[PDB]
Nucleic acid binder design. Sequence first.
DNA 1: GATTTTCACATGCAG
DNA 2: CCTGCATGTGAAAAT
Lengths: 75, 73
Amino acid sequence: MKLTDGQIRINHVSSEKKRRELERAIFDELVAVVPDLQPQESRSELIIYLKSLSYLSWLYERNEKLRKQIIAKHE
Amino acid sequence: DDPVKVRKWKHVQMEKIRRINTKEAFERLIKSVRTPPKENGKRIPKHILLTCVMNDIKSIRSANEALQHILDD
DNA sequence: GATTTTCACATGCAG
DNA sequence: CCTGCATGTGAAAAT
């Protein structure tokens, strides 16, 4: 049967709420795994994204540095 | 004049500017992340993209640890 | 078609 | 007072 206005409205609210709760959980995972990202920053999207990108860049840089060191230990 | 309405206006626009700057930071982040190919030309929701971020972080940490053990052998 | 999901928005309010 | 984050909702994209 056709959903009533009230049923449509709260389905809308809950769908939004669940997705925000989903995003926030990932924010908390990023706080946990990004050294320089602090729990106080766990709901500041701009800072999460910038510090995550910085961490990615450093991780790739480290990867380069190690590969060269192996290529060096084999001379 | 009405400083109250000006302050209301400024807060509205500065929220929209915060959203713009947040979106720019997000797009910069996502351009450096292995993301799924757009099947059927359908947008990828932010939270799916965020999972790709977490995956890439974990994936490269591991690779680096594996590289570290090789360097210690 | 109707419903779900997502994005963007204007606003309330803690600190 | 200011701002940064939280909320439900309009409109649009996806299902």
